[PDB]
């Protein structure tokens, strides 16, 4: 749950 990981 990385709040700043890219959209999937």
């Amino acid at each position, epitope marked *: 749950r*990385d*709040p*700043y*990981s*890219p*959209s999937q």
Partner: antibody
Framework: QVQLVESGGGVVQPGRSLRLSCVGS????????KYWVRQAPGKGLEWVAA????????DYAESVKGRFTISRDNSRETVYLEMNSLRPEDTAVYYC???????????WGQGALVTVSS | EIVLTQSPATLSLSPGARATLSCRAS??????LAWYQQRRGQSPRLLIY???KRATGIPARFSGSGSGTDFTLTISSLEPEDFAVYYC??????????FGQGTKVEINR
């Protein structure tokens, strides 16, 4: 290719506000987080603000928290930095940046100069 | 909090020489570390990420190594454009990104 173009720099008196814009092209703007990193004259790099891909998350350095607001409009491929209650030590070149994972600043803009002085 | 510090302040070398730059983290950052190059009057650009992976388009003379608290950026043979300032960078607790204070590579004489 990936390009980021900042606009909105200039001179502003202490206590006033200034809004920076950054428009992306050559990649899917909505996919990744966006950031602002600044560099005071003769100084090193200081991360300023971060915003998630859809704007649901925002975070700031303690030096600007409560005074700065980062936002984005993905339909216009633009990320903004709203700077209020500006101080002389906020004088810096402000770079906009985008990431491939959220961890690093993979691509950088050309920088916008903000000078805070009475 | 995690603090990055870099060494040396100034690295004085001849063109074509091998350059070794250091970055230290106050606590372990595993291999989550990036290196940036900033030439005079230019924006920073990403060189190395995840401690050892080269960014796209970056020449093979740049390499990174290290883990935990100690990291190195190596420039196998310096080119004229490589005389610049280099920054390392990390990210702790998902919501904070920080840099080292930078290392300047200058021309020795």
């Amino acid at each position: 290719q990936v390009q980021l173009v900042e606009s909105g720099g200039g001179v502003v008196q202490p206590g006033r506000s200034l809004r920076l814009s950054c428009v992306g092209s050559g990649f899917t703007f909505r996919r990744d987080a966006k950031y602002w990193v600044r560099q005071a004259p003769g100084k090193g790099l200081e991360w300023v603000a971060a915003i998630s891909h859809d704007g649901g998350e925002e975070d700031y350095a303690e030096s600007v928290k409560g005074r700065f607001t980062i936002s984005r409009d993905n339909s216009r491929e633009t990320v903004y930095l709203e700077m209020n209650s500006l101080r002389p030590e906020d004088t810096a070149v402000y770079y906009c940046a985008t990431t491939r994972s959220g961890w690093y600043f993979d691509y950088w803009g050309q920088g916008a100069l903000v000078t805070v002085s009475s | 909090e995690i603090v990055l510090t870099q060494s040396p302040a100034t690295l004085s070398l001849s063109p074509g020489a091998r350059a070794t730059l250091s970055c230290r983290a106050s606590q372990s950052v595993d291999t989550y570390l990036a290196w940036y190059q900033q030439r005079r009057g230019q924006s920073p650009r990403l060189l190395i990420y995840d401690a050892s992976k080269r960014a796209t388009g970056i020449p093979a003379r740049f390499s990174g190594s290290g883990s935990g608290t100690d990291f190195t950026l190596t420039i196998s043979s310096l080119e004229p454009e490589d005389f610049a300032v280099y920054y390392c960078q990390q990210r702790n607790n998902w919501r904070t990104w920080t840099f080292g204070q930078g290392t300047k590579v200058e021309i020795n004489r």
